[PDB]
Amino acid sequence: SGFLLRLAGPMQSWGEHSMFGERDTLPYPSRSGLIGMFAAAQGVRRGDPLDRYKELKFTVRVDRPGVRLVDFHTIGGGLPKERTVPTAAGERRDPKKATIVTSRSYLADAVFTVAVTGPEADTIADALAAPYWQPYLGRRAFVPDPLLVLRRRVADPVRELVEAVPLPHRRVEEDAATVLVDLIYETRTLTVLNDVPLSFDSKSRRYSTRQIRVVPTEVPATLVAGPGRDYQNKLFTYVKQCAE
RNA sequence: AUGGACCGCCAGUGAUAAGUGGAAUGCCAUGUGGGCUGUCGAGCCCCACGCACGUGGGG
């Protein structure tokens, strides 16, 4: 069981440890984010129990790391002296000091191939194919890849990440095989981070620590696509035999 | 419905005033394009007259 989401598109930003103006993202997706996306695809309002999404497994193969960019983001500026974002007491600020400036970072031009393995994976897949809310990647303004769900049904999808999945073009030496690609499994762990989601309600966001271990694996060089227009093509023909 | 949902960095601006590329210069000295030559029967149809050899009219 399981399916292979294809995390790609113009921009991605999985945030963490940022409860102020300055927002930051991780160099790889976080289960809280994509579990929020499945939850958004199944129609569970914030505050509902998320126990159903427990018992899931997410190994993610990073195709390209992508470069980090900072997004400057001012909110409430230029508006007249009687329209901004109120204060808790209700007394607005002076228009010269009214707007609030947040500089939210984001990860750009990267593509990940996650491998979901869970008991509810089939309904999750069928929910992503038709959701009850626009599914996004990190934040609402980021639009996901069209091929959000690369392969809908595969037994042992991890083996599919280790072999027979298209990769974007990169420098490959002559008649060289064994090109390394990093994938994260969850001793010899890399880091601990607040990912497991316990509650999404806006009144009390509650998360917990989760282990992460990045293993650099080797893949045969027969997956690297060509210079341009070849990668998207090869992945289309790859998603073509999904019916078969 | 994802440390996310809502969300503008942004309202003003001459790059400006001045300027010869200029004075000098044979592309030249040499060449057959040549031998050879008479311009003297399948066509598609109609009609008319016919000595069944043909003759003329309209397409």
Automatic annotation (TrEMBL):
Pfam families: Cas_Cas5d. InterPro entries: CRISPR-assoc_prot_Cas5 (IPR021124), CRISPR-assoc_prot_Cas5_N (IPR013422), CRISPR-assoc_prot_CasD (IPR010147). Gene3D superfamilies: 3.30.70.2660. CDD domains: Cas5_I-E. It comes from the Bacteria. Keywords: Antiviral defense. GO terms for biological process: defense response to virus; maintenance of CRISPR repeat elements. This is CRISPR-associated protein, Cas5e family. It comes from Thermobifida fusca (strain YX).
